[PDB]
Amino acid sequence: GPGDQRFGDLVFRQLAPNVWQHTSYLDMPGFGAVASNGLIVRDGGRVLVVDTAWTDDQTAQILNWIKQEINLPVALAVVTHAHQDKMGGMDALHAAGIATYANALSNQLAPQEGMVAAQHSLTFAANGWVEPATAPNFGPLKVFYPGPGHTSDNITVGIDGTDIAFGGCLIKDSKAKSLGNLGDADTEHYAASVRAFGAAFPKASMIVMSHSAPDSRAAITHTARMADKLR
Amino acid sequence: GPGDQRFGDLVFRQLAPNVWQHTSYLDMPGFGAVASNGLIVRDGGRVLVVDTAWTDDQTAQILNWIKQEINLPVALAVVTHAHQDKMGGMDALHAAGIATYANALSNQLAPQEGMVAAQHSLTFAANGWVEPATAPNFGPLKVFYPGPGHTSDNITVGIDGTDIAFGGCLIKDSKAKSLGNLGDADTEHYAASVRAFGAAFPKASMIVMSHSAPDSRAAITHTARMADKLR
Amino acid sequence: GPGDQRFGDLVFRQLAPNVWQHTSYLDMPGFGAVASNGLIVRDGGRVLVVDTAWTDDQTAQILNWIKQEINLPVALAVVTHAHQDKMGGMDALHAAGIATYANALSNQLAPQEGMVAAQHSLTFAANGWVEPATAPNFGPLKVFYPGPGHTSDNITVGIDGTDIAFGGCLIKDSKAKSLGNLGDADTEHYAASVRAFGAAFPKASMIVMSHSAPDSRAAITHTARMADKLR
Amino acid sequence: GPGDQRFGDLVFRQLAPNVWQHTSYLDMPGFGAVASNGLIVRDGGRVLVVDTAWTDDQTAQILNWIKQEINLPVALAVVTHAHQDKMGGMDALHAAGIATYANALSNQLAPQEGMVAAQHSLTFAANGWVEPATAPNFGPLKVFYPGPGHTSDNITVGIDGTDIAFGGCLIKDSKAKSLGNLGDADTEHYAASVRAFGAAFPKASMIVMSHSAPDSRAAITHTARMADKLR
Amino acid sequence: GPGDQRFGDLVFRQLAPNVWQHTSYLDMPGFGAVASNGLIVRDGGRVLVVDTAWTDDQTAQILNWIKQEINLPVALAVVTHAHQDKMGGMDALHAAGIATYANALSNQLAPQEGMVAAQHSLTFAANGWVEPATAPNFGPLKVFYPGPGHTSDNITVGIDGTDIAFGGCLIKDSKAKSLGNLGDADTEHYAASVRAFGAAFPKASMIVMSHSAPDSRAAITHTARMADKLR
Amino acid sequence: GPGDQRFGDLVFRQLAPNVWQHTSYLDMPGFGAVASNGLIVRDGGRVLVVDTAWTDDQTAQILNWIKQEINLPVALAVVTHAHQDKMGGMDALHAAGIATYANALSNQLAPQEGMVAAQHSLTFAANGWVEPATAPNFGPLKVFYPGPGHTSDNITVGIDGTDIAFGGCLIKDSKAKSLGNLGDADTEHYAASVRAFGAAFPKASMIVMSHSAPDSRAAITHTARMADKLR
Amino acid sequence: GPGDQRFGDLVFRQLAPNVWQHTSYLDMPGFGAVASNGLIVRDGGRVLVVDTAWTDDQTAQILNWIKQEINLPVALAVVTHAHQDKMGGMDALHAAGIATYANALSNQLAPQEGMVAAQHSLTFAANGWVEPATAPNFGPLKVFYPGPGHTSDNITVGIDGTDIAFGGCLIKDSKAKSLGNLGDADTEHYAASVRAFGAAFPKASMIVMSHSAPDSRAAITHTARMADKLR
Amino acid sequence: GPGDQRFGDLVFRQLAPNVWQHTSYLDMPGFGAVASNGLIVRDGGRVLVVDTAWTDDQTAQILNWIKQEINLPVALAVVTHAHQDKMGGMDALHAAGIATYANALSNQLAPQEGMVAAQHSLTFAANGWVEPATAPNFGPLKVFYPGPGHTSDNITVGIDGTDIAFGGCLIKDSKAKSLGNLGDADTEHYAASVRAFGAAFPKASMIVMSHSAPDSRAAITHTARMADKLR
Numbered sequence A, B, C, D, E, F, G, H: 001g002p003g004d005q006r007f008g009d010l011v012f013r014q015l016a017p018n019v020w021q022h023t024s025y026l027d028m029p030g031f032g033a034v035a036s037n038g039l040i041v042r043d044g045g046r047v048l049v050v051d052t053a054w055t056d057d058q059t060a061q062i063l064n065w066i067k068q069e070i071n072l073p074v075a076l077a078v079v080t081h082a083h084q085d086k087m088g089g090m091d092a093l094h095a096a097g098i099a100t101y102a103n104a105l106s107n108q109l110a111p112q113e114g115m116v117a118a119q120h121s122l123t124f125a126a127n128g129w130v131e132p133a134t135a136p137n138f139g140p141l142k143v144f145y146p147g148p149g150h151t152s153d154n155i156t157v158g159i160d161g162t163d164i165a166f167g168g169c170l171i172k173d174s175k176a177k178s179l180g181n182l183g184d185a186d187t188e189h190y191a192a193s194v195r196a197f198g199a200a201f202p203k204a205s206m207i208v209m210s211h212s213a214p215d216s217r218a219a220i221t222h223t224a225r226m227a228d229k230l231r
């Protein structure tokens, strides 16, 4: 004990001595309140953020929680693709003077997706790993592009020094009944991309995702199996 | 009763309490007067236009008919590809201060096709549906890119709250003897694109097209069959 | 009777049968709650907005008030310069699909001022009046650039069919003790610009401004006199 | 004998064995039908056009008159500034495949003036004469930029081998009561620009202008005198 | 009688009452003097040029021959790809004020090929035929892009009203021992492109090419057969 | 005690509990070893750097000294103009992943000055103070553009919470015999710019400059007097 | 005798009367000091450089060695791909005023690879050989793009008048146990690219590479065999 | 003895052991054959060229003369303004692979002047001297922008190690009757610019110019006196 901290409209669940999952909620007609998960990482003397909340106001609340509970500057934020639940709060990050990073493709896609682009673009080598020159001061954040799946631009993040890997919206939990919103999905390459994510972080035992509590590696396998049925 | 209204050089046929088909004519050496069809949609307190007439003057006549018969501001116009019969009257729309929208590819293609580009570009998700952020205030207009067919950029429009779907020049009537002008056609993907249009609006029973009176879904099937013979 | 309507955190004061002043408030350390004024114009079947509120949330409240009290589409919005109290709520307008307009210089200045640029740029003739081609569907809104003053980009708006002229932050009331925030001011040309505004709308008897209740033409004279002391 | 030829809605007056003045009319509320004048020049085996008519349709009529009465290809057209009466018919010229030329500033100004830009830009030396490299195949057309006056971009044309100089809208006849539309005028430099035009073509005895029948050099002097009263 | 006219360093052979072949020579170490052929077309009252000579000086000689023997303005020139023998004389054309046209790809390729780009870019429909809007005043010149072969950008020209088709360097004579310079060749698509050229001008009986006297359709067949051996 | 710390080839002199002056040296033929001064500021949990050293290697040594003696991340660096002694070490900062800032004009000037541009551009209001939106996380660093002097782009920095103002190369000590390198100087505005710097930081009692130990406000007065003799 | 010259931190081994191999070293955690090889070519009265050293300082030492041992201007440098060991010293070359050349793709890739781009871009024909117009004054340097392998942009250089071909990092020695760093490798096309290199320089008997002493053609064969196991 | 060498159509006069004046001629209707002068400088092991000849062919002859009489690579060429006599032969320099340099303004002006731009742009400090970073390997060539005169872009060159300064077309000989072609002249600043040139090279005793044999400093004084009469 104790339990997941409620701060404002958000929930923070500590996953590791230096890692927290931030959760925000959006009301969707019929589907109740839909949770979206991101991460907060303390690395020495600075905080790293993965994904925004649904909105600018919710994202501001994240920064407030950080200030109150951690009290270290937020050095940077990386967002995992151009959808509202991951990049809906970019303005809040920028207003706070936080350097933001996204896949170059995410920034390209941002206008048509109605999102505000990140200030900096990540570029990835042919093997999927981020080119280090485009990801300065990322520290323990290992960024990997597994290929097109949930979206064309979806990227994933592993946390060095932990057993945690963040699949974002590419990954669903081990009992999910569907792959959810496939509006921007690449049905052909989805399955391969899921498995590439698993191979990129072969030792991760806690898989964090956007819309379900952290699961085991079974989440990866189950998602890839659902994705096979699309091609 | 009564019949199709003649206004100036144009004909307007009411298809629904809030939908009219606008028809303009161009003299083509040998082929008599060739009709081109577009749509006019009343949605609450504003009018939406699909496609221009062959010319700027004819398009001005459309706007005049709207003012006389409907008397609501034309909020926007969407044009379905970069050919004279669909975008020949862009200048008239722009002179009237009407916001115009086309497929991004249509605007790219406009100069080589001798057309004036729309002021705004539509972008489509991988599944063919327009990204909502690029189509503000479209209301009941459901815009879908079925893939290359009549042209590389041809798009289609369904009207929510009705049984009407507009195939433009992609679709021919159920007894057409050919697919017409294939000067910019994608013979390989034409058939698949036609069928994608049909699947995108599976409940539509009135199929509107550029050069023939509204037909049934048989128009879709027959067009796809003719298109099969090209690949 | 009755009095100024309170809606959410905002106040709306009707100035004319088709004109309302919208007021929003921002807490400034020491200066209490500082009011910023804009305008709302009903012109036939559509609403025109002049200036946003301080914030996106407050601006959303403006749109909500319009929907409840007027129930007509907001055809466009024009913002009078790149400062928070005039352009702080651009995102809210854009999210609502409202076409936004600003001085071309305002859009140029927006990034350095930390503002979101308008979607469309206004250009002005040498005499100060907006070039009509860049201001489509403005209706009764007569837009005039009086020259540099409060800022380099500040523009003014007269409302045809009324005795109302909006000076924005260029004009202060007839008893103001100073010209306020001169952080971006052109001290040399301020006085001349104020007088140009007065001459541009010579018949206006109700002068609306950003931070004080509507005043008479004495507001113009008094502001110009204060501005003389800067050069 | 005989008199000025009426062709369609236009009037053509022969000024020289190889020069005609083309006149088109636009209805202006109160000011009756307002004439705008341009020039047509036969130079050997090709026709040169100075200025369009008010509209695209009227400009098409010019080309038709040329074909019927001269029957030589229109090698090029030069337009004298970005206003409707001079550049309102650009689309007609471009549709006919005619190479169009304007002051670089005119093309820059075209969008805000609601005009279609010329395809090619003229650049002028410090002395006001067109740089020959930017005016290929102009033949007897001597193009001169006298400085800002009626507009910032207004240019003038002399016809080599004749006593004719075209002042466009910069020049008014010797009994004009005002300088007309000063909406885009440079009141400071107008007078000097008029006199520069006169000095550029010191031997011209027939001065052609936009809105009045050809006059003598008294038109230049009288215009410059009216312009003096603006500074 | 009589024979092929020698003018300066060039040879002109009349192929039709309004068509001449222009030939220029360049010394290549070992291969003697290598001839390159282009075309000259009289169409009414103007001359059309296909391809330049090897050099600017030789191209100037072409223009001089035209002036002496035809005495009509050269309305335009089209060049068939970005190699020295086809575009080596662009500067001479531009100095003479002649509007030049090339495949858009040719202009893109011009810098790396050490060529001066044409002033205007031709764009081709999916079927290979030039989009008319990009080829104004081409008259009897029917321009067709057969696909990649000799180069990626090579285009071909048929002359309406004659039995002549110009294959440029894509086509070799019916007894050629090789396809010559394949330095920029597309060995995979060469054969298909040759046959597409033949199909595009199915009635042409005189096939003109760059490096050999006009041949029959056997030149097309033989070239395609040689090209088959590359894939 | 004790004295100025020697670290590598550099000297660090503590000016305040959170401010150090960094000094690097470059051998100039005849003028011995020429010192260039910058600043290092500790603000809470991060370090701020003003100006680089002469070279990349020397600048790397600065970062090493910071790590050893302070052990806090360098959040950002601001450089005061595009000359070797101020921006010669940009590559070292960028290699370390440090966000760099300069006057927009400095970045514009960087190529011609042979300098590497900063990653971010500072923009200044008309009154000379930096627009806050372009200077995120600057903390106690108050950046002011005094106008052209030593160079066109020279900027100055005050340190909030101290009596220190940094004039860079604009200011010389109170006994300097000349204004030094005037190769890029604005001789007309130099004097006024010096006095503007003094007025911008009216309470500063320790004036830090590039080439001489910290002096009093007499440095400002004396520099302005020398600058008067240039106009 | 004698042996390989040690100059500063570098080693120079003469391969031919006008060719030297330059070697620089970088400490890699665990892998000892890793050598990277480039070439130096004397061609008449000027020196040509292939590849930089790991660092700017090491590259400066190369230039110093050239000055001391050869004493001819370095006309140009060509770098073989965007990695530290080949382009890490670009700044040193540029500071010395040496014209630098790289594959256009290398310059495109330079930012994401953290490299400084070359000043000029090489473009290659479809057959792999450099387009001569983009490689002026290269002399005996025959530059060939074999296709993607070690990286997407890797190019190779043969030295005319010698038996030497430089494979860079594409080629490993005849007993290498792996293909080394495959972080940016194209595993699919690597093998074919290696063999293309061999075919491009079929007579070369001394194969020079980045990380091993010059070997025979067995290096090519062995590398291609290792590369086969990747696809 | 002996006299000025005639090579082809050109004359070369040796001014110093390492400096030659190159002269080319162009026939101008009435003014006989007009000479234009440039310079050739041997600096160690390479040749530097100042200005081209009137034409590409004449410029090629310059390069041929250099090869025959000096036999050293031409490292670079600098051209002194965008007029035919100074930049008419740029193509010849570029074809030979010679790096060309001009005032940035000259390159900007080149298209309108009908000139081919230099490959590299020179930028000048406020004092008129070229910024060294933009003039690599210039050696003894001291380049100075004296301000607008003959043209807006005219630059001047001094030769270190000699008593020679090249004024180009800015300077006329000590008995010239006029300032010649003032078509692009700045009549206001001409005089001051001439005197600035004189002050920039205060020790030069041989003044070289475009259209007259080398003169004394009296050429400078006399030119400045003629220029005074223009303002």
Ligand SMILES: [Co+2]
Pocket (backbone or CB within 6 Å): A056, A088, A089, A090, A091, A092, A116, C091
């Ligand atoms: Co937002």
Ligand SMILES: [Co+2]
Pocket (backbone or CB within 6 Å): B056, B088, B089, B090, B091, B092, B116, D091
């Ligand atoms: Co039109």
Ligand SMILES: [Co+2]
Pocket (backbone or CB within 6 Å): A091, C056, C088, C089, C090, C091, C092, C116
């Ligand atoms: Co906002």
Ligand SMILES: [Co+2]
Pocket (backbone or CB within 6 Å): B091, D056, D088, D089, D090, D091, D092, D116
């Ligand atoms: Co038009």
Ligand SMILES: [Co+2]
Pocket (backbone or CB within 6 Å): E056, E088, E089, E090, E091, E092, E116, H091
């Ligand atoms: Co040429």
Ligand SMILES: [Co+2]
Pocket (backbone or CB within 6 Å): F056, F088, F089, F090, F091, F092, F116, G091
């Ligand atoms: Co550096």
Ligand SMILES: [Co+2]
Pocket (backbone or CB within 6 Å): F091, G056, G088, G089, G090, G091, G092, G116
């Ligand atoms: Co470097």
Ligand SMILES: [Co+2]
Pocket (backbone or CB within 6 Å): E091, H056, H088, H089, H090, H091, H092, H116
């Ligand atoms: Co040339």
Ligand code: NI
Pocket (backbone or CB within 6 Å): A099, A119, A120, F099, F119, F120
């Ligand atoms: Ni940044």
Ligand code: NI
Pocket (backbone or CB within 6 Å): A125, A131, G112, G113, G183, G184
């Ligand atoms: Ni990489």
Ligand code: NI
Pocket (backbone or CB within 6 Å): A189
């Ligand atoms: Ni695939």
Ligand code: NI
Pocket (backbone or CB within 6 Å): A174, A175, A222, A225
């Ligand atoms: Ni499962």
Ligand code: NI
Pocket (backbone or CB within 6 Å): B099, B119, B120, C099, C119, C120
């Ligand atoms: Ni818009």
Ligand code: NI
Pocket (backbone or CB within 6 Å): A112, A113, A183, A184, B125, B131
């Ligand atoms: Ni989408």
Ligand code: NI
Pocket (backbone or CB within 6 Å): B189
């Ligand atoms: Ni396909």
Ligand code: NI
Pocket (backbone or CB within 6 Å): B174, B175, B222, B225
């Ligand atoms: Ni059927």
